Design a protein around this nucleic acid. Structure first.
Ligand SMILES: [Mg+2]
Ligand SMILES: [Mg+2]
Ligand SMILES: [Mg+2]
Ligand SMILES: [Mg+2]
Ligand SMILES: [Mg+2]
Ligand SMILES: [Mg+2]
Ligand SMILES: [Mg+2]
Ligand SMILES: [Mg+2]
Ligand SMILES: [Mg+2]
Lengths: 70, 82, 25, 181, 118
RNA sequence: UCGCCUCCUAAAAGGUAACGGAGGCGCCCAAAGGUCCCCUCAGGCGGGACGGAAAUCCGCCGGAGAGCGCAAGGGUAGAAG
RNA sequence: GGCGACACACGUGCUACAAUGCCCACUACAAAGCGAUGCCACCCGGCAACGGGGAGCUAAUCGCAAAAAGGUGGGCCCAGUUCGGAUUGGGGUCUGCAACCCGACCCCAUGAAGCCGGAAUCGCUAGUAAUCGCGGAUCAGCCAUGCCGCGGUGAAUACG
């Protein structure tokens, strides 16, 4: 144990969207772009797009020209 | 790529629409990719001509801008000696 | 880049105009 | 005793929730997350030690605990290596350090993974344990990117006093284990 | 700065550094920094952290990019899996999609020459 | 073919022949030696990035089928490993 | 439907591998030809292709066209890179009864191979080779990087 391992200091770390604690590790504080426990990407879900379906839009895009209708 | 036209064959549609009231039979041919996938009568089979014979293509959503004959290859290839 | 469709030079070579080569003024 | 947010989060939230979900009658029947052991299959160091040492201090930085080299049990001419030969690092961490690692794992590293739709829910042992693969090791906050030489990963084993892989499925779910539904 | 899925480009003009992302190219590049209101000719070397945050927040959102849209593109080709069209078969055989000449050329999809001889 | 080692022939002590049935040896190790202190294998089934029938890791089950420098026999984890 | 097929082989080419270079902006200087069952100024919508308008022109009158290489200014700084543009996804436009097989452009995103070529092999002796753009025929459109022409800048060397 003694005289080999790195030590573990108190808590402080910077998130790209807000805050984070714990840290310990080796560094006093570090930077993190993609935040975690906050919200983006599978953390409350932020549906960026939806990936268009052809049954919906393309039936109403090709079908927007309802000249072929009936 | 049309935009204000976006056409289907009148004769393909005539045969397709007057055989669409309250149900039908999948026995329906054609002779023109020229058309378009047509919503409604999705649960249908359209025997498309590939130059030689009438290939029964099946519609199950998914398809739209792809008219017909894309679902009817005209060549065979299959292999080159191997 | 005489074959790149995103240059005034490629647009010349192709002949056509556009965003990367406006029809003057 | 330090503190650790995840540690508390276990006691004053995750702990009573389990007694409600499963209705344990004893304070010990409840699943207790203990022992998390990191392992790196290091064939890369088939014939290199300065590539092994760089992987050592790298690991020591993310866990705060020196790893130990593992050696090949036998000999496989089919893919080199003999009896000796440092092929693989491994560090065991339980208590305090296990929690400090588990926090930065769930609450920094895991989301920093490319795309990442969530941990596999079938990746459960059958005796209440979990394991998960990792590609890049730069996803750990203590890794500075511009100080690496190779993208070497690691296997992670999380051992738990649960019986079934359901009670653990629950225990980790509460602690913050994204499971891709 | 770890903008999207990448971080690489240091001292090399943000309008150019942006390009180094699958989803940015050149048009979305200057479009993103004029809409975020940042000088294009900057160092990219981690300048004003605020500009970097705003840039990241706008770019990474808005439109799909990096590994996510690669998945969508691959899925759009997976569209013509099922009982798909003619265009799908061209993705199947590994041949050019747009009906071009395959008697010669088409090496960018066929790959290097194999030579049969006879 | 000629000396030495192991198994069988060998008829439940020892011993026992044939130009009977099968294999080894003419070395090696300053640790593979002394002692003190620790530790338990092979396999099978799950779990796990690159990693597959086998690489390391976790988890159960596994009395010894592993290992014991090299033939074979005997022995051996309550150790000789 | 096919002439457009593709495991491959050859010819004629086009575009490049970059800094005597690329991108952006500004600003000059041609000839030879073609057009009122068309060329379409100038406005208007549009990032743009293009669409709405709509003047002039049976045309040394009006239009196609601003020639481009050049010059000025600025930016990249030599790394498959602001070189290179293939391939592929998506979104559009125009002709056309219709563009899946097989049309040309436009815009967004991808950005491949190629860092200058083995044995071999070609052209050119003065406005020439090299390099740069322009026009016409056929033509609804166009797979033209082809062919027939036009001019811009403008070498090297020939002992024998
Ligand atoms: Mg073809
Ligand atoms: Mg006896
Ligand atoms: Mg006996
Ligand atoms: Mg006896
Ligand atoms: Mg000893
Ligand atoms: Mg022909
Ligand atoms: Mg290469
Ligand atoms: Mg170079
Ligand atoms: Mg002569």
């Amino acid at each position: 144990k003694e005289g080999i391992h790195p030590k573990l200091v108190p808590a402080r770390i910077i998130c790209g969207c807000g805050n984070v604690i714990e840290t310990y590790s080796t560094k006093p504080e570090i930077y993190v772009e993609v935040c975690s426990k906050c919200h983006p990407f599978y953390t409350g879900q932020q549906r960026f797009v939806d990936t268009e379906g052809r049954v919906e839009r393309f039936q109403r895009r090709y079908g927007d020209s309802y000249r072929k209708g009936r | 790529s049309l935009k204000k036209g976006v056409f289907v064959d009148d004769h393909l549609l005539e045969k397709v629409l007057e055989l669409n009231a309250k149900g039908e039979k999948r026995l329906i041919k054609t002779w023109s990719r020229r058309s378009t996938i047509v919503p409604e009568m999705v649960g249908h089979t359209i025997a498309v001509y590939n130059g030689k014979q009438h290939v029964p293509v099946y519609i199950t959503e998914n398809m739209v801008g792809h008219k017909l004959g894309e679902f009817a290859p005209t060549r065979t290839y299959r292999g080159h000696g191997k | 880049g005489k074959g790149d469709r995103r240059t005034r030079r490629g647009k010349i070579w192709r002949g056509t105009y556009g965003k990367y080569r406006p029809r003057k003024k | 005793p330090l503190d650790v947010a995840l540690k508390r989060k276990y006691y004053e939230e995750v702990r009573p929730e389990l007694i409600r979900r499963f209705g344990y009658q004893n304070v010990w029947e409840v699943p207790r997350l203990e022992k998390v052991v990191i392992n790196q299959g290091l064939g890369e160091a088939k014939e290199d030690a300065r590539i092994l040492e760089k992987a050592a201090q790298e690991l020591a930085l993310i866990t705060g605990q020196k790893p130990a080299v593992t050696r090949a049990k036998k000999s496989i001419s089919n893919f080199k290596l003999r009896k000796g030969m440092p092929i693989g690092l491994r560090v065991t961490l339980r208590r305090d350090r296990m929690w400090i690692f588990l926090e930065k794992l769930l609450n920094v590293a895991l989301p920093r993974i490319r795309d990442f739709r969530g941990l596999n829910p079938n990746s459960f042992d059958g005796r209440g344990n979990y394991n998960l693969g990792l590609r890049e090791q730069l996803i750990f906050p203590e890794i500075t990117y511009d100080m690496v030489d190779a993208l070497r990963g690691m296997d992670i084993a999380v051992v738990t006093t649960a019986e079934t892989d359901e009670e653990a499925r629950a225990l980790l779910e509460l602690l913050g284990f994204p499971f891709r539904k | 700065a770890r903008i999207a899925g990448v971080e690489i480009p240091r001292n090399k003009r943000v309008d150019v550094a942006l390009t180094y992302i699958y989803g940015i190219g050149k048009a979305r590049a200057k479009e993103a920094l004029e809409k975020t209101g940042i000088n294009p000719a900057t160092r990219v070397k981690d300048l004003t952290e605020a500009e970097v945050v705003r840039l990241r927040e706008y770019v990474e959102n808005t439109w799909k990019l990096e590994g996510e849209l690669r998945a969508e593109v691959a899925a759009n080709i997976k569209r013509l899996m099922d009982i798909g069209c003619y265009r799908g078969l061209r993705h199947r055989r590994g041949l050019p999609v747009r009906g071009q000449r395959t008697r010669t050329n088409a090496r960018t999809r066929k790959g290097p020459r194999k030579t049969v001889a006879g």
